[PDB]
Structure formats: structure tokens, C-alpha cells
């Protein structure tokens, strides 16, 4: 489900990288910039872009992240349950916390989760330290989650007899 552009987004960049290519006259040099873009109301996307100029890569990455967005569950400013984001040899274990701990996360993961607007999540990185793989792992993890009321309507029960 594509989301429209009628939102205010904070487009805080996470990482640029010096990227090479070898040709007969030596090396050509580009910059691959990946950013994370999303409002505090529970929508997050990431973006990647290659350019010969760093702000050009920035605008390309923010256009790609505006193209690709996904919405996260934000009930009680903290995720409903424990999850493991698993993609590509990065394993981000996400666990909900009580309401005063603050977000405890590694760098790219804390950028994504703080840009989501979660308040209290304990996460651990059990995989590799590659930033794009952490980003794809944590977005797959945040996509995997589901509402308590969604579980209620798919099981045909009500939220009070799910909780007790």
C-alpha cells in the first residue's frame, strides 16, 4: 500500500560511502548515500542513491525513500511484542520496554526507531555490522509486527479475552 506525500518528514541521513569503479584511465569515484526518512507518527522508509555529488545523492535517496514507505504499529508508544528482524546476516532482536527506559539501540537501528517515534525498545544486533543490512533487517522486523486488534479479528475473539 503506497503512502502519499502529504506528510512532514525529517530526512535525517545516516551514511554516505565512497564507492569506486575501475576503467582504463584509472578510477572513477561516486558516492553512495543511504538515508532514513519518516515522520514521528509511525511511518518509516529508507533510501539509497548513487551520484557524483553528495547533495545530489542526498536528494536522490530522499526521493527513493519518499517512494518507498511503510507504516509501523505504535500502540502505547512501544511495540506490541518481541520480534527478530532477520534479513541478510544482520539479526536485530527488538523487545518492548517499560515506558521510561528510552530507546536502547545501535546507531542505524536507533536512527530508524527514533525516526519512527518509538519511546522504549531494547534491541540487540546479533548479526553483521553493515549499515544497509541493519536497515533492511530492522525494516523487515518492523513490517513483521501486527496489531492486537488484528490478532483479535483474525482469531474471531475480542481483545479482553486475548489479554486474559
Amino acid at each position: 500500500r503506497i503512502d502519499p506525500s502529504k506528510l512532514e518528514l525529517e530526512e535525517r541521513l545516516v551514511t554516505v560511502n565512497r564507492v569506486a569503479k575501475v576503467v582504463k584511465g584509472g578510477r572513477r569515484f561516486r558516492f553512495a548515500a543511504l538515508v532514513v526518512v519518516g515522520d514521528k507518527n509511525g511511518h518509516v522508509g529508507f533510501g539509497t542513491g548513487k551520484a557524483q555529488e553528495v547533495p545530489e545523492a542526498i536528494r536522490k535517496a530522499v526521493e527513493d525513500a519518499k517512494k518507498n514507505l511503510i507504516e509501523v504499529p505504535m500502540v502505547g508508544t512501544t511495540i506490541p511484542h518481541e520480534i527478530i528482524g532477520r534479513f541478510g546476516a544482520g539479526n536485530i532482536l527488538l523487545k518492548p520496554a517499560s515506558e521510561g527506559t528510552g530507546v536502547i539501540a545501535g546507531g542505524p537501528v536507533r536512527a530508524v526507531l527514533e525516526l519512527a517515534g518509538v519511546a522504549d525498545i531494547l534491541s540487540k544486533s546479533l548479526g553483521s555490522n553493515t549499515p544497509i543490512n541493519m536497515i533492511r533487517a530492522t525494516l523487515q522486523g518492523l513490517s513483521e509486527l501486527k496489531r492486537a486488534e488484528d490478532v483479535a479479528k483474525l482469531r474471531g475473539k475480542s481483545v479482553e479475552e486475548l489479554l486474559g
Binding site: 490478532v151 479479528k153 483474525l154
Partner: protein, 131 residues
């Protein structure tokens, strides 16, 4: 051979769900009937009935999809495998996906789910997680 049949029940359910099949047939012990009716009561499956035969008896289970494409039963796990058994007291009895996912735990009377096992304040064999 096939060691335990609980693992084959749980992975037959998982394989049919992940291929999004409509029904299954299982060799139908009483623990199979009990786990299947726990799943029927908890709504993770749509239907269950057992046909009798001199072979073992065969139980067939009908999966649930309310909307046109989803997986209601989002994962299955065996915990009390042979070779490493696992048990629970009445106070560390587990809730996995707290409020959202169930455990099948055979206590000293009946084979019971987690929330009613807590309401009874008894523990036992913690055998299945349904995610």
C-alpha cells in the same frame, strides 16, 4: 522411526500453512485430538474432525483464512523435545507474544493452554508454542 509425533503434527501444520493448503491428515493419537481441539477452541484453525479406521485412526484439520490472503497461524514451535525435556512452575509459566500467542502445556490434569493454566495455578510439560 519418526521419534515423536508431536513434531510431525506441528511441522505438518506449518508446511501446509506455508504452502497455504486447505486441510491435513494426521495419524490421530489422543494428544493429537487434544492439541487439535485446543487449536479449534483458540481459533487458530477453522475445523477439525477425526475419521476412525483400523490403521491408527486419521484426524483431518481444516485451516483458517478469514480474509482472502493471510496466515492466521503464524508459526509453530516444539519446545519439549525428547532428549531435552522442559518444565515450568506455576509462576514462570510462559506467555510468548504476551496476550497474542499461546502455549500448549500438559499439566497434572488435562492438557491446557497458558492463560487457563495460569488461572488454575499449575504447570507441567511445556510442549508447544503457537506464535
Amino acid at each position: 522411526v519418526m521419534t515423536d509425533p508431536i513434531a510431525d503434527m506441528l511441522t505438518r501444520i506449518r508446511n501446509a500453512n506455508m504452502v497455504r493448503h486447505e486441510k491435513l491428515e494426521i495419524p490421530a493419537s489422543k494428544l493429537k485430538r487434544e492439541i487439535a481441539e485446543i487449536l479449534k477452541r483458540e481459533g487458530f484453525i477453522r475445523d477439525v474432525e477425526f475419521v476412525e479406521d483400523s490403521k491408527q485412526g486419521i484426524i483431518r484439520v481444516f485451516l483458517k483464512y478469514g480474509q482472502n490472503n493471510e496466515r492466521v497461524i503464524t508459526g509453530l514451535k516444539r519446545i519439549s523435545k525428547p532428549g531435552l525435556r522442559v518444565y515450568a512452575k506455576s509462576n514462570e509459566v510462559p506467555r510468548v507474544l504476551n496476550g497474542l500467542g499461546i502455549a500448549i502445556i500438559s499439566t497434572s490434569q488435562g492438557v491446557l493452554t497458558d492463560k487457563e493454566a495460569r488461572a488454575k495455578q499449575a504447570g507441567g510439560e511445556v510442549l508447544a508454542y503457537v506464535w
